[PDB]
Design a protein around this ligand. Structure first.
Ligand SMILES: [Zn+2]
Ligand SMILES: [Zn+2]
Ligand SMILES: [Zn+2]
Ligand SMILES: [Zn+2]
Ligand SMILES: [Zn+2]
Ligand SMILES: [Zn+2]
Lengths: 239, 75, 72
């Protein structure tokens, strides 16, 4: 697993690195969650390690009939425990061939490879700014299947980042803001409403027909408002 | 592992979960803490609505990460 | 360097090895610690059993990584 170069892979280390780091591919047994399973064959693509249960083996634990392999990643920047895992940022690759950043044209490493047809390559600096600026301007795209993402910076079709942990490049505070905005957008995409009472903003999913929306045990602020004008609930037409 | 469920008001609930716990499990836990019936709960991670059948590991939801909780109003 | 040894899901204790230490040598010290024969021990690391003749560095064992060792 270690010698596989599907050019090291990169994780987001939440601690103590708090950054994108070269990762280690490892594997446990998907049944007893112990790193005793031996792989039948090694993974050849990302799908082999990312798709659950895709690869098989034999858990060498005495009382375990585990056959399915569960791949996990660890930060390679320091010793990690057996369960001290990190999310794989599979779009990030060592820029071994010195591909120039689609945006700033500089050669940096590593880089993010957009899954557009052109496999557009962006340095992490530009990706960070691309993310920060698009976030602040509410330019992140909501996809009902994928979530709150960004396409290729070139704007290539069918290029929305699927692994949304890539937006870990936003740093902690902006990442949480991203998650917040995404959830808000999701609510609005599902035809819901954000509670308009100041210091609230609770995501609400009322009946599509309902005009009366009550921000109802400790979650809502109790404000009963009109869906349309967002003022205190009223009979008849708005204003 | 410890995860956080936050309403869009920033109201935060801590959950003890396993990466193998289903979204339906998460909701049951949310109900256990706050008393929100699971049918009213919609969990969102990074803008994607989490499906009851899937697990946290299905979404690569890490230790100390945050799910967003919004409410399905039925009244 | 140090290698962590998880012996049948037991808490990983450290084993100081050398770059050229064989897997069997590692099996020995573990066997001495666990009071078991070294022949009934298998060394699982990175989804592959490590063969007795392989050296620590050969197996791409990084400093303070973990190897599982099971029995029979
Ligand atoms: Zn790290
Ligand atoms: Zn097992
Ligand atoms: Zn750049
Ligand atoms: Zn592109
Ligand atoms: Zn409210
Ligand atoms: Zn109105």
């Amino acid at each position: 697993l270690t010698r596989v170069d599907l050019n090291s892979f990169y994780v987001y280390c939440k601690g103590p690195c708090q950054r994108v780091q070269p990762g280690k591919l490892r594997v446990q047994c998907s049944t007893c969650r112990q790193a005793t399973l031996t792989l039948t064959q090694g993974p050849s693509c990302w799908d082999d390690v990312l798709i659950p249960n895709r690869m098989s083996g034999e858990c060498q634990s005495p009382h375990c009939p585990g056959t399915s392999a569960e791949f996990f990643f660890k930060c390679g920047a320091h010793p990690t425990s057996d369960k001290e895992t990190s999310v794989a940022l599979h779009l990030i690759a060592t820029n071994s061939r010195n591909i120039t950043c689609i945006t700033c044209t500089d050669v940096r490493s590593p880089v993010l490879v957009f899954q557009c047809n052109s496999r557009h390559v962006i340095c992490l600096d530009c990706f960070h700014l691309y993310c920060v600026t698009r976030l602040n301007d509410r330019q992140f795209v909501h996809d009902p299947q994928l979530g709150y993402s960004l396409p290729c910076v070139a704007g290539c079709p069918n290029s929305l980042i699927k692994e949304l942990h890539h937006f870990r490049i936003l740093g902690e505070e902006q990442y949480n803001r991203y998650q917040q905005y995404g959830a808000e957008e999701c609510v609005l995409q599902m035809g819901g409403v954000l509670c308009p009472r100041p210091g609230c903003g609770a995501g609400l999913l009322p009946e599509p027909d309902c005009r009366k929306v009550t921000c109802e045990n400790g979650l809502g602020c109790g404000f009963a408002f009109c869906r349309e004008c967002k003022e205190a609930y009223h009979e008849g037409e708005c204003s | 592992m410890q995860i956080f469920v936050k309403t869009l008001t920033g109201k935060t609930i801590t959950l003890e979960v396993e990466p193998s716990d289903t979204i339906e499990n998460v909701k049951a836990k949310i109900q256990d803490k706050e008393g929100i019936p699971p049918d009213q709960q919609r969990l969102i991670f990074a803008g994607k609505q989490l499906e009851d059948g899937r697990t946290l590991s299905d979404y690569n939801i890490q230790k100390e990460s945050t799910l967003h909780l919004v409410l399905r109003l039925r009244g | 360097m140090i290698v962590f040894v998880r012996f049948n899901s037991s808490h990983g204790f450290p084993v100081e090895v050398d770059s050229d230490t064989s897997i069997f040598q590692l099996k020995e010290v573990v066997a001495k610690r666990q009071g078991v024969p070294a022949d009934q021990l298998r060394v699982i690391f990175a989804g592959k059993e490590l063969r007795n003749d392989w050296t620590v560095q050969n197996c791409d064992l990084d400093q303070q990584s973990i190897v599982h060792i099971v029995q029979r």
